[PDB]
Design a protein around this ligand. Sequence first.
Ligand SMILES: *[C@@H]1O[C@H](CO[C@@H]2O[C@@H](C)[C@@H](O)[C@@H](O)[C@@H]2O)[C@@H](O[C@@H]2O[C@H](CO)[C@@H](O[C@H]3O[C@H](CO[C@H]4O[C@H](CO)[C@@H](O)[C@H](O)[C@@H]4O)[C@@H](O)[C@H](O[C@H]4O[C@H](CO)[C@@H](O)[C@H](O)[C@@H]4O)[C@@H]3O)[C@H](O)[C@H]2NC(C)=O)[C@H](O)[C@H]1NC(C)=O
Ligand SMILES: *[C@@H]1O[C@H](CO[C@@H]2O[C@@H](C)[C@@H](O)[C@@H](O)[C@@H]2O)[C@@H](O[C@@H]2O[C@H](CO)[C@@H](O[C@H]3O[C@H](CO[C@H]4O[C@H](CO)[C@@H](O)[C@H](O)[C@@H]4O)[C@@H](O)[C@H](O[C@H]4O[C@H](CO)[C@@H](O)[C@H](O)[C@@H]4O)[C@@H]3O)[C@H](O)[C@H]2NC(C)=O)[C@H](O)[C@H]1NC(C)=O
Ligand SMILES: *[C@@H]1O[C@H](CO[C@@H]2O[C@@H](C)[C@@H](O)[C@@H](O)[C@@H]2O)[C@@H](O[C@@H]2O[C@H](CO)[C@@H](O[C@H]3O[C@H](CO[C@H]4O[C@H](CO)[C@@H](O)[C@H](O)[C@@H]4O)[C@@H](O)[C@H](O[C@H]4O[C@H](CO)[C@@H](O)[C@H](O)[C@@H]4O)[C@@H]3O)[C@H](O)[C@H]2NC(C)=O)[C@H](O)[C@H]1NC(C)=O
Ligand code: HEM
Ligand code: HEM
Ligand code: HEM
Ligand code: HEM
Ligand code: HEM
Ligand code: HEM
Ligand code: HEM
Ligand code: HEM
Ligand code: HEM
Ligand SMILES: [Ca+2]
Ligand SMILES: [Ca+2]
Lengths: 144, 144, 146, 146, 146, 150, 147, 147, 147
Amino acid sequence: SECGPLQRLKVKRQWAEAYGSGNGREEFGHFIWANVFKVAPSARDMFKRVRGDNIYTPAFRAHATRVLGGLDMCVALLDDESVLNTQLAHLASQHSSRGVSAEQYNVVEHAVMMGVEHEIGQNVFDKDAWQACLDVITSGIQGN
Amino acid sequence: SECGPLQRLKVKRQWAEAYGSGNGREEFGHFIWANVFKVAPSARDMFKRVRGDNIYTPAFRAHATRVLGGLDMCVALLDDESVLNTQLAHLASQHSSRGVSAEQYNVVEHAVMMGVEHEIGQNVFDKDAWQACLDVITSGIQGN
Amino acid sequence: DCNILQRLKVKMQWAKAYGFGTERAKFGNSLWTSIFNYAPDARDLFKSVKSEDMRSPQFKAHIARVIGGLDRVISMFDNEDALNADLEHLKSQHDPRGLDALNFVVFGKALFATVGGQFGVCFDLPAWESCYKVIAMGITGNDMFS
Amino acid sequence: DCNILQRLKVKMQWAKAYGFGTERAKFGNSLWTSIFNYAPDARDLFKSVKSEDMRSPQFKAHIARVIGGLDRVISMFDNEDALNADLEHLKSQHDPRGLDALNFVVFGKALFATVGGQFGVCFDLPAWESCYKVIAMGITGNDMFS
Amino acid sequence: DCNILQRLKVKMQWAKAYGFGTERAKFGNSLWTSIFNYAPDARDLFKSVKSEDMRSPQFKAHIARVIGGLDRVISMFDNEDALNADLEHLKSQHDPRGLDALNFVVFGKALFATVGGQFGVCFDLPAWESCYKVIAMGITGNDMFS
Amino acid sequence: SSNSCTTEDRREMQLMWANVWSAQFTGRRLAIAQAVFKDLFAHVPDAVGLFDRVHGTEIDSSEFKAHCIRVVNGLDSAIGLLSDPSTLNEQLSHLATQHQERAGVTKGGFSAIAQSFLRVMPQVASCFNPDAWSRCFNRITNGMTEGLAE
Amino acid sequence: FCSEADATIVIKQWNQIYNAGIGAKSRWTMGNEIFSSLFKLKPESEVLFNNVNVANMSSGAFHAHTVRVLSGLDMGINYLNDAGTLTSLTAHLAAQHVARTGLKAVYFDAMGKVLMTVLPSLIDNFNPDAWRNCLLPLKNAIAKGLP
Amino acid sequence: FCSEADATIVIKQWNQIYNAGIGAKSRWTMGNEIFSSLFKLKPESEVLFNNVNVANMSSGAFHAHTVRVLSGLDMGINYLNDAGTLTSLTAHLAAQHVARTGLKAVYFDAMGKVLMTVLPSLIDNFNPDAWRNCLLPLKNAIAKGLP
Amino acid sequence: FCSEADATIVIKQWNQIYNAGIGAKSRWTMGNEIFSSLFKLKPESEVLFNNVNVANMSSGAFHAHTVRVLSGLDMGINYLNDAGTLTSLTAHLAAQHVARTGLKAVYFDAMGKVLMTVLPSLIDNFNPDAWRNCLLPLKNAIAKGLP
Ligand SMILES: *[C@@H]1O[C@H](CO[C@@H]2O[C@@H](C)[C@@H](O)[C@@H](O)[C@@H]2O)[C@@H](O[C@@H]2O[C@H](CO)[C@@H](O[C@H]3O[C@H](CO[C@H]4O[C@H](CO)[C@@H](O)[C@H](O)[C@@H]4O)[C@@H](O)[C@H](O[C@H]4O[C@H](CO)[C@@H](O)[C@H](O)[C@@H]4O)[C@@H]3O)[C@H](O)[C@H]2NC(C)=O)[C@H](O)[C@H]1NC(C)=O
Ligand SMILES: *[C@@H]1O[C@H](CO[C@@H]2O[C@@H](C)[C@@H](O)[C@@H](O)[C@@H]2O)[C@@H](O[C@@H]2O[C@H](CO)[C@@H](O[C@H]3O[C@H](CO[C@H]4O[C@H](CO)[C@@H](O)[C@H](O)[C@@H]4O)[C@@H](O)[C@H](O[C@H]4O[C@H](CO)[C@@H](O)[C@H](O)[C@@H]4O)[C@@H]3O)[C@H](O)[C@H]2NC(C)=O)[C@H](O)[C@H]1NC(C)=O
Ligand SMILES: *[C@@H]1O[C@H](CO[C@@H]2O[C@@H](C)[C@@H](O)[C@@H](O)[C@@H]2O)[C@@H](O[C@@H]2O[C@H](CO)[C@@H](O[C@H]3O[C@H](CO[C@H]4O[C@H](CO)[C@@H](O)[C@H](O)[C@@H]4O)[C@@H](O)[C@H](O[C@H]4O[C@H](CO)[C@@H](O)[C@H](O)[C@@H]4O)[C@@H]3O)[C@H](O)[C@H]2NC(C)=O)[C@H](O)[C@H]1NC(C)=O
Ligand code: HEM
Ligand code: HEM
Ligand code: HEM
Ligand code: HEM
Ligand code: HEM
Ligand code: HEM
Ligand code: HEM
Ligand code: HEM
Ligand code: HEM
Ligand SMILES: [Ca+2]
Ligand SMILES: [Ca+2]
């Protein structure tokens, strides 16, 4: 499937519903990262500086906050290729010296999808739209 | 991390919240043992006498009741090293002729933590405090 | 005036004040009631849509079309290209009717009263006066709205 | 022009929007928050009443004096002699502070948003713009209120 | 008397009766109201904390300190070492005031009335009389509380 | 009074912000930041230089826009966490290290932009409470500039 | 000032005869009866109002005076349950009197008796005790510093 | 027209992706997808829009066209429960398409298929029956008479 | 002092780990951790407690000391919303530390850091801002005047 104009609108609305204004953001990010580290416990070693060993700590919670803030910017820009690709390049450089594998990117993708579904319900979750647009996002954070 | 005086107080309060007075105890113990046997299906063979094949049976429910009653005593005594270590020795002898591996002990630890978190919520769950004090508990049930 | 900040402000308040479903027809009935009250003569200008009876479907359809116009215009407040192109469209529809521009001043007043009353005390009147002008100008061409 | 009919409509709408008890303090706080949001720089002209903390007793006392003035002034709308005497009394208190008249324009805009926001959709903005001019003209003198 | 069972019983009931937050000041206001009612003369003994006016902050602070004292004492009911050490502390504070021991009998009565009324019908009066004695004795040294 | 950013000021600031905040499109955010920087620049000319990497001389370029979006994202993250200060402290330190050791980036410039926001918000936000806003905006910048020059 | 329960009675009783819906005429009508009563109890105080044309009490200048007076009393009453603001309000009011010379404390005591005599004729089932409890302190605060 | 319960669903689903709180960009983005699809189905109909600059679908003139098209659809939808006004609204809209050059009823049948194909991609749990019951009637009214 | 909403949070969090239904053991356990930490920060201040038997922190005399220290803190906290009484309560407490030998205001700054460091370990979602807004003011009152 492709992340077309329509899929970008769906993703924007469903992301806004899931992410919300902030009250459920902590629970939202916790669910996501609890999923990532369970599917890939090995990856937490890359988060030594933000206490990846304990995702319940303020330090990790701040990181999770930053990450979701990153996803938000990309979702918000999905309909502005120009500024979008500029933002993906910024995220790319923030991950360049850390050796993230296309496999770990996909992990976080699934984690993000489950968390969003968990927030808005399987009844409305559009898997095709999210996978396509998440591919577009990570693909860009990995340069290509 | 270490199971110090402060961590022992936190664990006591959070355990009291999760374990409660008894109404949610069945669901509490079921969640825990459903987790243990899924992470280590092999281990249920040690529970032949208490129907480990069916944790929905009264027999198993009684065992789960006993186990949590054991954890409760230890949590309650965390601030009384003297009587604590005496109780750990009793539990040690109740498991001596059964060949439990330090690996299975750790399993039950994680199972216990998830169940408590499940009961009080990730928002307040103190992973560091629980892991340290659970290490102290199982470590003692295994003699050392 | 009517920079980008006031345009976003006006879109926010219009969204809230305007509302969904049937509350739309109410807001419109009020807008048009204030207009004919502020300037009773303007009522004769709509005999083509049966202004003779404000509860009639012909005049309700007109009400719907006008607030529908206000809404699409306000929604394009951020894209000048589509905005002017549409204001130009609305202009070609009003020009052949020889409408006195002073009635667009009355319209705006009624509009502020209706949006302000429905939105509440945080209604931004200066932003509304400044951005309404843009709209009336695009429809009239009268520098009165400069 | 603010004829007698408009003065009456305005006295009626004010009464309803001003209310009783603490609703008045709320109306006042809204009026003044809107003034400082409409012209963020006017806030400096009130250091004498501690406008740094709008919820301080000094400023709240100032909010009450002002709406209290609006009230008595609006209640005298029907008696020219009493009205003009009090407006002069107010000008006397505002002159020694050399105030830019344009601020009084902002004040009026805020007054409309607050009253209309509290009164609702039947707010008669034209009547309010006209009659507020009489108060403004009477307090400042600036023929910009002519 | 006042074995370990009655000490735990008294801690239970005190916890319930005492309560959290602002209900604390109420319970205290009642305790002190009963005291001055049971023995009106004792009131003159607190001019240093403005007993002249029970709603005054100086006397509220005193009330807070006293129930705060009762609470910490009751909380140490299970550890004699800290209990006596603290009762000894409270003793050194009351000794230099030449207080008549009979007023501690009145205090206890007021205390039972206040705790019993707030806790209800399962109030354990015998346990309270027996364990209060321990407290009054540690503060007074009077064998009256033996 | 105290001037501290209270629980109620925080609730209000989240309201002032959540209402104006567009959770789907950059249109609103972007417009709010650009305007904040225009104001910052017009009051502090020398400040535009600090943004050459993000094309601060061209507020409408894809690069400055993306930067405005990041600033708006940092503020949003901080306004949300006013509710959970333990985590807020960790996030304000991170932001602090992201502005630290940057030639030209001082507390003076933060006070400046603070006034830029006070001039921008009322124009776009309805029911703006400048008092509660500044008390908490300052709570946030204080964490961001702990290790910066005056 | 006064208690919350006393303040409530006063506020409610005042609102009966004074509020945004009460026209100016009724207002200066109560005003004239009150100042006329004041002058009769303390004839010497009358001259203090030559600046508001006390000479002709049915003049625009004297009507506006009584109106702002009553408006000042209204403001004070409605803030009886906000001691912080009322304190600041009373201080300001006093400043506007102490600024004027000739005023004596006994003139405010007289005003007090005027109100206690006038209001029961305007207010439904007037409560002299609640009003005394709240007016007294209010009057003292405004006349603070007067000889 | 259509049931009151059907109308409720359509209104609810439509307001999900279209309401006064949505940016125009998304408005025309949905617009262009809708017409590009109509073109691919019936390419013969594209020329009809040469007047709104169909040549360049990213132009303000064309963006404005899709905008008013969608506002009309919105207007129609929000009145589903007011048979009287909607009848009048559709007749007007119907008049704005008759007077237009080169319009066959079959084009509104294609458009229908496009809406039934585009909407489900934007709307949560899109309901084709409820939408069919409410729009088909509308479409016949806006396309009643033409070729 | 501090906001009414801040006070509510502090009271709630504090009653989580301290209330009339908690055993004294835990009371002094928290007490010893608090002082041991104050000692490590400012070891020079330990001697000040030689009177309550600071030599042996497991003694009834010292346990009783931490107990009353905590009851005082509790007393202060539970009155956060009663400015009048709390002012009076702090002045008293303030008097009990002035008359004491060797007390510098900086010790109460250390204590503050200890509380901000110990509490989060005992309290669910401890709120440092709310606690800072409510205790800093209190600490200044109990430490206003000293070195
Ligand atoms: C206390 O004040 C009140 C109110 O006065 C007002 O307030 C003061 C502060 C001042 O600012 C005054 O300027 C202001 O009016 C006084 O009562 C008023 O007294 C006036 C008298 O000046 C009453 O009006 C009378 O005069 C008018 C106008 O007269 C002029 O115009 C006519 C032309 O039509 C000329 O012929 C005159 O030479 C003059 O230039 C007049 O229209 C009225 O008379 C009409 O009605 C009569 C029947 O009653 C007919 O016979 C007449 O032909 C004519 O049609 C008035 O006589 C004014 O109405 C009152 N105000 C009220 C509300 O009653 C009060 O006198 C003062 N106390 C004192 C003694 O100074
Ligand atoms: C259909 O219309 C679209 C949309 O354009 C709109 O509608 C038309 C009908 C007209 O009314 C337009 O006025 C209206 O905006 C057409 O696509 C747009 O076309 C413009 C072409 O001007 C695109 O603009 C690009 O270039 C501008 C300005 O370029 C000049 O100025 C810059 C200085 O800023 C110089 O450096 C250049 O040398 C040049 O002289 C500029 O805003 C952007 O360029 C920068 O940014 C790029 C990133 O986006 C960089 O890659 C560049 O290197 C440079 O830094 C614009 O890209 C405008 O963007 C497009 N719209 C889109 C969304 O792409 C379309 O062509 C038309 N169809 C036909 C064939 O007529
Ligand atoms: C700081 O104070 C603490 C706490 O003590 C308290 O405070 C002091 C200031 C004094 O006021 C004390 O009176 C008060 O309790 C000091 O630590 C405590 O010290 C006592 C020492 O007596 C510990 O008690 C151990 O021994 C007692 C009694 O021992 C005698 O009697 C038994 C018969 O029951 C005989 O068998 C012995 O030969 C002896 O003559 C007894 O209760 C316990 O001993 C049994 O239990 C142990 C397990 O806990 C076994 O391992 C033993 O083999 C035996 O069966 C006590 O252990 C008391 O427990 C400690 N407190 C703690 C919590 O450990 C501390 O020393 C002081 N600092 C200094 C240096 O002065
Ligand atoms: C799904 C897309 C992802 C987004 C939007 C994202 C976003 C972010 C953001 C905003 C930061 C903070 C950068 C800074 O301020 O320095 C960050 C840091 C980081 N990210 Fe990601 N990230 C994504 C995926 C991943 C993946 C798949 C991994 C690897 C398993 C990863 C590993 C890291 C690491 C190791 C850091 C540095 C943490 C630190 O500060 O010590 N990220 N990411
Ligand atoms: C987390 C700490 C643990 C506690 C507190 C605990 C507690 C208990 C208790 C109270 C009993 C009942 C003893 C009796 O009355 O005879 C029991 C039995 C038993 N436990 Fe545990 N246990 C723990 C961990 C484990 C682990 C890790 C395993 C192994 C996978 C295990 C295996 C058993 C077995 C096989 C029995 C005997 C069941 C029977 O009666 O047939 N326990 N445990
Ligand atoms: C800025 C505010 C206004 C907007 C947005 C607006 C919008 C519209 C719209 C959308 C139509 C329907 C066009 C069609 O589909 O045929 C319309 C029709 C019309 N408008 Fe306005 N209008 C505005 C102000 C006015 C004013 C102030 C007058 C004059 C007093 C006026 C007089 C008319 C008339 C006479 C019609 C034709 C009604 C008919 O179909 O018979 N409009 N307007
Ligand atoms: C037209 C509506 C207005 C009314 C009814 C009004 C009324 C009042 C009143 C009753 C006072 C208190 C006088 C006293 O007793 O000392 C006052 C004071 C004042 N007013 Fe106005 N005012 C109005 C508009 C304005 C405007 C637009 C400004 C300018 C920004 C302004 C600036 C001031 C200042 C600076 C003071 C003095 C504050 C002090 O230090 O006490 N007023 N006004
Ligand atoms: C057993 C119950 C009682 C307890 C727990 C108790 C506790 C206390 C406490 C904690 C203080 C404050 C000490 C300080 O911080 O300086 C105090 C003060 C005082 N108590 Fe008691 N008390 C009790 C009974 C009494 C009785 C029966 C009297 C006498 C009639 C009394 C008379 C006083 C006086 C005069 C003060 C000093 C007040 C001041 O600061 O001026 N107390 N008490
Ligand atoms: C309190 C409001 C402010 C917020 C929320 C904020 C936020 C941010 C964020 C999120 C970044 C990007 C960090 C990254 O991804 O690496 C950033 C970068 C930066 N900020 Fe701020 N900032 C604020 C105020 C300021 C001020 C007042 C100055 C100074 C005059 C400043 C100067 C900079 C510079 C120079 C950069 C680097 C830009 C670049 O990427 O080249 N910021 N800020
Ligand atoms: C307690 C009831 C009273 C209230 C609420 C009250 C209120 C007021 C107010 C609001 C003003 C106008 C202030 C300004 O805007 O500049 C005023 C002025 C004045 N008051 Fe009072 N007042 C009271 C009693 C008195 C009494 C008892 C006297 C003395 C006999 C008095 C003498 C004056 C004078 C001489 C003026 C100045 C009039 C002028 O501007 O020419 N007041 N009063
Ligand atoms: C049911 C969906 C449709 C709706 C809601 C709709 C609505 C509208 C509206 C509101 C206008 C602008 C009227 C004006 O202001 O003058 C319009 C114009 C037009 N429509 Fe439609 N329409 C629909 C389907 C179609 C279809 C299927 C065709 C055929 C190919 C079509 C062809 C046109 C043309 C040719 C114009 C005139 C464009 C111009 O100004 O040059 N419409 N339509
Ligand atoms: C804010 C936290 C603190 C609270 C709530 C507190 C409370 C108390 C209380 C209730 C007492 C007993 C008073 C009596 O009954 O006579 C006390 C005593 C004392 N406090 Fe504090 N205190 C605090 C901090 C400190 C600090 C930072 C120091 C300094 C090193 C200190 C030094 C003392 C000393 C030396 C005594 C006397 C001990 C004795 O009886 O020998 N306190 N404090
Ligand atoms: Ca992928
Ligand atoms: Ca372990």
